[PDB]
Amino acid sequence: PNPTITVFERSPDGGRGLARDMPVRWALEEVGQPYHVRRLSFQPFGQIPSYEQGDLILFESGAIVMHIAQHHSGLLPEDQLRRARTVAWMFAALNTIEPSILNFTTVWLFERNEPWHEARLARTKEQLLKRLDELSAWLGDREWLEGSFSAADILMICVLRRLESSGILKDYGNLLAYVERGKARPAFKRAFDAQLAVFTAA
Amino acid sequence: KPNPTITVFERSLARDMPVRWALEEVGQPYHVRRLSFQPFGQIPSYEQGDLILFESGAIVMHIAQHHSGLLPEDQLRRARTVAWMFAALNTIEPSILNFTTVWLFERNEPWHEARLARTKEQLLKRLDELSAWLGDREWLEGSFSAADILMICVLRRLESSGILKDYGNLLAYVERGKARPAFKRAFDAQLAVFTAA
């Protein structure tokens, strides 16, 4: 039947589409699968999003986007050489790029109270800047990560959008344009609007 | 299909261990190229024909989906296995990485005991959830899988710290994987490049 995903009824991003349900929503919209939504209040880690389809219950945004991408057309290449490299970028987005971002942004957004705030911020920015240098050096002049738009691009773009609040992507022209390219897609916009409509409802 | 080539440094628990373990578990012979100084400059590279791979999770995935025993055939079982492979490397492993880099690399920095206590509390919460899921189960989700390879390797970076001692079921989980013959064969082959230098 139809997938049911769970989002929070009140988003900490405040209607900015930054929670981990954004990649899921985007993927479902990109694939054209109608889906049901449940709002929650307070899965082995008790987070969002959960993904439900019959007896199957999924967790982790990476794996949800994976399951959507392989049971439908449009998000993964047919060729297995191409498909394996896509999976590499999906893992790279979440275990290589995202932690570098998260370490910096937590200091930048929330740790202004801490005593050695200045010195720790400089250390996490240093590590982030090398990761982005590497990411931007790879992408160069490409439209997407690897050929056609893929589930890796959804994950990488949603990960990179966590850096909008800090303005760090201003020094990376191709990475900035790359995020904008993803945002310009009608599926992103459909997912963004539905996310924003949850925020206005509560 | 030709035998894969992986790439390690001669400097080390390194990221090739899960890849080594997966290849052993599955029985694929493999060549090892050595290096000193992948868009991100990380070991291991995985080369097989025209396919080049990076990311330990992606390499392990590829090994598991084209050979037998590390991924369940059932699509609902298989999907959940992928969830755990993701949870290991983006939910459990960063908490581990953030604690270990304070615990070892940033002793001389004057913000030590403040930062160490915060990362430990965030770690303990992750381990609480992991212990709670695991319970008295042998493995994460049914039979041994590639998720267990990734998780056990992730958890072994906590050996130096001794934090796993208050999580009896997790400590024994690590030993359960270590006692597998394929682990030992992958452990020794990793130790063969350790001694040649």
TrEMBL record, chain A:
Q: Which InterPro entries is this protein grouped with? A: Glutathione-S-Trfase_C-like, Glutathione-S-Trfase_C_sf, Glutathione_S-Trfase, Glutathione_S-Trfase_N, GST_C, Thioredoxin-like_sf
Positions of the GST C-terminal domain: 79-202
CDD domains of this UniProt entry? Answer: GST_C_8, GST_N_GTT1_like
Q: Which Pfam families match?
A: GST_C, GST_N
Could you name the domain of life of the organism this protein comes from?
Answer: Bacteria
Q: Which residues form the GST N-terminal domain?
A: 8-76
Describe the family membership recorded for this protein in Swiss-Prot or TrEMBL: Belongs to the GST superfamily.
Protein name as it appears in the record: Glutathione S-transferase
Species, as recorded = Agrobacterium fabrum (strain C58 / ATCC 33970)
